[PDB]
Amino acid sequence: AKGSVRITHREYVSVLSGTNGEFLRNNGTGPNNDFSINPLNPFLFPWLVNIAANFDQYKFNSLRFEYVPLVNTTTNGRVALYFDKDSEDPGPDDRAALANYAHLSEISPWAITKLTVPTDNVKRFISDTSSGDPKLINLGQFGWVAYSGPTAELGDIFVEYTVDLFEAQPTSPLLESLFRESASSVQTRMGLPYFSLEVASATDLVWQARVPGTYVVTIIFNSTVGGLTPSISGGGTINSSFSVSTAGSSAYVANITIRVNANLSLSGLTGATNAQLFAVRAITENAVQVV
Amino acid sequence: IAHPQAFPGAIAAPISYAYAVKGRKPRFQTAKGSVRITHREYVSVLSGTNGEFLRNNGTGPNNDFSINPLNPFLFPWLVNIAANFDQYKFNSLRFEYVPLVNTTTNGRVALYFDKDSEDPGPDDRAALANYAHLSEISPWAITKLTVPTDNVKRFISDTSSGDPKLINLGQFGWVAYSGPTAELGDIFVEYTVDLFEAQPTSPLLESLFRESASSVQTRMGLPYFSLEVASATDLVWQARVPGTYVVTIIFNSTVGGLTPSISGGGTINSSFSVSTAGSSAYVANITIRVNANLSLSGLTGATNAQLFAVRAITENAVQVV
Amino acid sequence: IAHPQAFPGAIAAPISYAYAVKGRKPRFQTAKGSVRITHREYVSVLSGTNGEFLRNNGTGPNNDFSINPLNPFLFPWLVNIAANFDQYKFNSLRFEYVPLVNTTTNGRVALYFDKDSEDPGPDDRAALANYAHLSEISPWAITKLTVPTDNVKRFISDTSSGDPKLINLGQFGWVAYSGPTAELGDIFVEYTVDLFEAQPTSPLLESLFRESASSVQTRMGLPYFSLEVASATDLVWQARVPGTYVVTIIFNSTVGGLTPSISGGGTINSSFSVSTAGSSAYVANITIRVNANLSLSGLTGATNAQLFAVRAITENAVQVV
Amino acid sequence: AKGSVRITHREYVSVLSGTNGEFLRNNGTGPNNDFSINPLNPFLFPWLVNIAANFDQYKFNSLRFEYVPLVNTTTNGRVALYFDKDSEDPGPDDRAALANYAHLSEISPWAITKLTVPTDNVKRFISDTSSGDPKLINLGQFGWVAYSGPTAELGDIFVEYTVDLFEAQPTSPLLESLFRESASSVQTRMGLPYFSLEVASATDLVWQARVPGTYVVTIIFNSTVGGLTPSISGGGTINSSFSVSTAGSSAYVANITIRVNANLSLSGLTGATNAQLFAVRAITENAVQVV
Ligand SMILES: [Ca+2]
Ligand SMILES: [Ca+2]
Ligand SMILES: [Ca+2]
Ligand SMILES: [Ca+2]
Incomplete structure (x- = not known):
């Protein structure tokens, strides 16, 4: 053939x-x-x-x-x-x-x-x-x-x-689009299953990483101010970070090197509903450089 | 190959042995x-x-x-x-x-x-x-x-x-x-x-029954579980064979309910219970290890208990409540 | 040997044929x-x-x-x-x-x-x-x-x-x-x-579940039984495979009890039920034939039913009541 | 040997x-x-x-x-x-x-x-x-x-x-002794299991025959008068019969030719308790001749 x-x-x-x-x-x-x-x-x-x-x-x-x-x-x-x-x-x-x-x-x-x-x-x-x-x-x-x-x-x-x-x-798409709501429970995913969604509250957002490697994530959601609480509840390293948060609209992009099966947590949320994850695989020199 | 400062006839101790088992x-x-x-x-x-x-x-x-x-x-x-x-x-x-x-x-x-x-x-x-x-x-x-x-x-x-x-x-x-x-x-x-x-x-299920007051317990079928405590306050069954089961437990208390737990290694995947009067029933989908216990605690005036266990997979989950 | 008033080429009808089948x-x-x-x-x-x-x-x-x-x-x-x-x-x-x-x-x-x-x-x-x-x-x-x-x-x-x-x-x-x-x-x-x-x-039990209100029924395991009537007044399961079973049936009515019967060919050997509130449970040792029904009648406001069937022998009898 | x-x-x-x-x-x-x-x-x-x-x-x-x-x-x-x-x-x-x-x-x-x-x-x-x-x-x-x-x-x-x-x-005994009580429920049997006991009430006594053939039965019990109601609720023939019944004591002997799996019934009982069956196998010319 x-x-x-x-x-x-x-x-x-x-x-x-x-x-x-x-x-x-x-x-x-x-x-x-x-x-x-x-x-x-x-x-x-x-x-x-x-x-x-x-x-x-x-x-x-x-x-x-x-x-x-x-x-x-x-x-x-x-x-x-x-x-x-x-x-x-x-x-x-x-x-x-x-x-x-x-x-x-x-x-x-x-x-x-x-x-x-x-x-x-x-x-x-x-x-x-x-x-x-x-x-x-x-x-x-x-x-x-x-x-x-x-x-x-x-x-x-x-x-x-x-x-x-x-x-x-x-x-086939080599990226991930993971959407959630609030007000509902529907959790439609599209693209590779790099990250999974553990809980979408209104206080906290936790994405668990099913695939070891270096990424560039874009997470976007609707709260009521607050936001800035990023951490890796596993083995990983947020190598580059950008945040912006106001009213019913905030956005986080970062160059994490997640691994094994680590964790991504947005803690200080307040009044959050809709949320969406965008994952693509990258190196580290794909580092965010605006603050 | 080749071991330091040794004469033949020596026996040399390694630090660990790996034996490899294949399917x-x-x-x-x-x-x-x-x-x-x-x-x-x-x-x-x-x-x-x-x-x-x-x-x-x-x-x-x-x-x-x-x-x-x-x-x-x-x-x-x-x-x-x-x-x-x-x-x-x-x-x-x-x-x-x-x-x-x-x-x-x-x-x-x-x-x-x-x-x-x-x-x-x-x-x-x-x-x-x-x-x-x-x-x-x-x-x-x-x-x-x-x-x-x-x-x-x-x-x-x-x-x-x-x-x-x-x-x-x-x-x-x-x-x-x-x-x-x-x-x-x-x-x-x-x-x-x-x-x-x-x-x-031949059937491969378990039917383990006790009375109370007669003191005797009777088993038919395989010995997946064993009865360890009688009591009127507690019922504990013990896993003898590791695996996932769909257990059905029925007994005679006097009103009250029950408090299920898995002491030892194991998890409950899908519970359902209905407990009243002089009759109670608890069916569950448990995964359990050898020598762990499935205890029904917080019982009150309990006589006469019977267990039905069959092997299942975790996904044979109980769906009602 | 030898057939009356016949020419060859005749085909002669016997009155019955015996074929013998051995194990x-x-x-x-x-x-x-x-x-x-x-x-x-x-x-x-x-x-x-x-x-x-x-x-x-x-x-x-x-x-x-x-x-x-x-x-x-x-x-x-x-x-x-x-x-x-x-x-x-x-x-x-x-x-x-x-x-x-x-x-x-x-x-x-x-x-x-x-x-x-x-x-x-x-x-x-x-x-x-x-x-x-x-x-x-x-x-x-x-x-x-x-x-x-x-x-x-x-x-x-x-x-x-x-x-x-x-x-x-x-x-x-x-x-x-x-x-x-x-x-x-x-x-x-x-x-x-x-x-x-x-x-x-692989597990050989049956797990047949329905809701009510969602209308859909889901089966895991072997097709010993099938669900024929939904209802809030009746639940009837049908035997697809003849034999003796220990069936466990759990559902959500609103109070009342249940009336079990075997329409068609079959007998119930050992019943036990506990029915109240919004939860009921019925476990039995039935022997049943193909196309017979196990009906739970006299129900009242019944939604959500699940069945667990495993093959047993008649002597795996339920002993409590 | x-x-x-x-x-x-x-x-x-x-x-x-x-x-x-x-x-x-x-x-x-x-x-x-x-x-x-x-x-x-x-x-x-x-x-x-x-x-x-x-x-x-x-x-x-x-x-x-x-x-x-x-x-x-x-x-x-x-x-x-x-x-x-x-x-x-x-x-x-x-x-x-x-x-x-x-x-x-x-x-x-x-x-x-x-x-x-x-x-x-x-x-x-x-x-x-x-x-x-x-x-x-x-x-x-x-x-x-x-x-x-x-x-x-x-x-x-x-x-x-x-x-x-x-x-x-x-x-080993070639006869049957089958005892019952009233007041109890114990039903001790001794000898061959020719006949079995279906129910022992106070109104009725029913013995089912597990073994085809000709017998001579002796049945004895405790009632309060009455008794005389013998019948074969199957395929059989009470070829010879003797009865005697008074107070808390009555006795029935008969040369039945029971078969397949027939039945022996004492109907008109009244206030019966203890009862015992004695079965031996015989021909028919072992016929009872007193009345
Ligand atoms: Ca056999
Ligand atoms: Ca020894
Ligand atoms: Ca497999
Ligand atoms: Ca076709």
Whole structure:
């Protein structure tokens, strides 16, 4: 074929972390939706996404996840990587469930292991992992568990792959538009799911970051004066900041380097209703310079 | 390669051992009369607490460390297949312990097996030694206990169907004494079973009932939960098999309501209760760990309680209130 | 031997045919990647009523005549094994009709198959003919319909998991027109499936929920029961799969109680109810037949109902009141 | 061995009957207890029982049940014989369950079929089928179903076998003693379970017959005058009768030829409490001759 491009690459999935005396599947993230293998999924494929945004279909030829320890040799416990063909089945809750997965790999946190998921031969659609039936669009589900260890960053998980992409299309949006109201509850999202919305009160706005990296965020909302209370309730660094706030109208832009699964908080709000997030991925020299 | 300032015959201690476990697909084949399954399942994590002679973690050796298969704790995956058959015979049966812990750890872990399905505990470290089928190691090491398999078909059944000595092969058990207070290793089981006589599927739900005043409690079905406190003020059930359940609990108090909680490890995902008069009912979608408790507290004049537990996924949520 | 006053080439009508069916043990074997099961299970009895064009007995062609396996109605025994796997592929699949009735009987029985898992009904006898996979016979005769098996893995799933065209192979169905009003024959299925990708066991319970006011009803798990009437005065559930269940039903009325009954074939073995305020709960141990109803009548201002059904045996009786 | 006697024989199990438009397992009898294969079970082995009463242990070498039609060739429907190794598992409720039994045999009611249950090699105890763990004492369970047919006696079920019996013992009672009270509810039974007790009121006494054949019954109880109301609420014939009734003390002896699963009723009772049944098996020329 010759509308067919083929890519081989190794990129960054996520950091595998554990908490002391807990099971902790997928870093405690939960909703086994953003761990579907479509690619397109900027959590699993943060580098492939800029390419796959330009195509309609994908087929993996080889796909392998790799754990490389960040932790030292005296560390106790166990990490585990698993893969289910059903991208929609729920995760493992206990260790007993974890062990029945056909495609499983477990090793002590200071060692290296890897998991080779099996690829089939079918073209599927590159889409949102929320844009229709999971079983039709996703090869399957990926996930990890870390138990009986300490409470720390245990390792880096990489993914190495060879995909075919097919059918060039106009680019899917490589940015995020996340809208909310007040007065309602509707929370329409458009573009990649970089950030998620935890709560939209009238006092506080909290956006949790599902995707590690450096961004430029634009947040805009309706309050009644106040505003200036930005902080990172996780591991991150507001490298550049601009704020402006008056009546029923305020706006915040910033060059955060969020990571793992950190947090973005607008605290001193007062009488807030509508709000919208705009996320794009950038470096740091994309730094805001007006105050 | 190559170790400093050493003569041969030295034994050199590493600081930690990594053993790597990969997923294992099950093998089926029919021995003309029997279906034969080979697979590896996860028994339990093995923990000890400091300064205790910790036997079977908390728990103690009861009737779900009995080998039959049909035993959700010992054979989570196999249970479903076994329900479709009437009798079984183990061919090979090995328990394997994979260390979770580094070699500065110290203490003892031990695996034992006894043919008396309802053999009581080893009472202390000295008794523990007298078993014929015993493996004792340092917690940072790997080991395995091979269970002697005899050559007799016994019925596939939950432990509530007459003499356990008739249906169960024996009893598995572990102990951790001395040593720290931590999760020391994984305990896997490797097995090859023959299943005989296909039949219509046995039910896999639990029905645990108590009265009050008669004092006796009766269980049918699998031992997912156990009843720990009777009382008229409290009802506590204990998880014996980790997982997500849709539990239905019905009982006779005198008016008042109930206060549900999960002491220990676990979360409630979807509650619903209706409590009055001399009748109350509580149905919930819980995820729970081994040895955690589901307590119904704040009861008032409660007699007669019954529990219905079935395995579900978290998303089988109760939707009314 | 030897028939009176006959020339050869004659065809001689007997008065009845006896075909004898014996029990069939299942065969397992692993095709290196897949486990392969061959077995024969009982689909349903095939009845007609007089002067009706009776399609799928009462019922009508819905989403549990869909082939997937994982389908309690079509594969009672297989369900349990299938729950332990992620995808399937049928190798051979035959439906077989064994006459229950003598040759003075008359009328037509017909078996059909359609790839559209959610193909609607054949509307009349003429439409019924247009199927490509059809078998039409006199009711006193024997026949079998062979379903074309393709060569693609599809997911093992209950019919409540996205497009049924993705997970189900096709749809089975039967019709009986003209003829008397009686039970005409047995319908067996012979199959060989390959199951792939072992996984932790899928839940086999049912969770059927409705609101009221939103009008929509949602099902998770197997289709043992179906919701037929909403109402604020009545709640009726219908058995789609014959057997004994422990059903838990919870809903929101405004005070009053409930009046349970089993219209159609079935018996209640152990009731318990608590009904007040804006919350009621009814748990029971019922044995029920295909197309019978479990009705909660005498309701008063009832919105929001949820059902939990699991297979049990009669002896899993509710013990409180 | 030479405390070992070996018997080969073919005797009468029961009549297989159906009711129109019903499933009807075991003639509607129910409690799958008196269908356990021990022998000793006077329902399955009415001829072997007189022998096995004299021994402690049994092993079957071959065992086969046989259905011979009583019904004609135009009869519709289907009979089925099944066998479970677990004498304690409940019967089949629907046809779907019936079909999953490994040892099953079904044929149209006007034809002959048979079922060969598989014998193992273990000695078990000859006992009550209520005298301890079913799985330890019974080879298994037998049973039959008749569906989609008419409402009639469809056929005779016979059993053909070869047993070894071991260990001579003093004879187990070949009679029945069934006691009841009033004032209590306790209902102690001793000997073979020929008859069962359905209700013991104060107005009526009803004994249902679990075992086809000719008997001599002695029933004795405590009322307050009255008594004389004997009848057979099934298929049977009170071939000989003696009654005597006064105050808190009455007594009935009779030579009934009960069958299938008939009934014995004492109607005109008044103020009855204690009662006891004595059943022994006899011919008819064991006829009561005093009035
Ligand atoms: Ca799955
Ligand atoms: Ca012992
Ligand atoms: Ca169609
Ligand atoms: Ca059984």
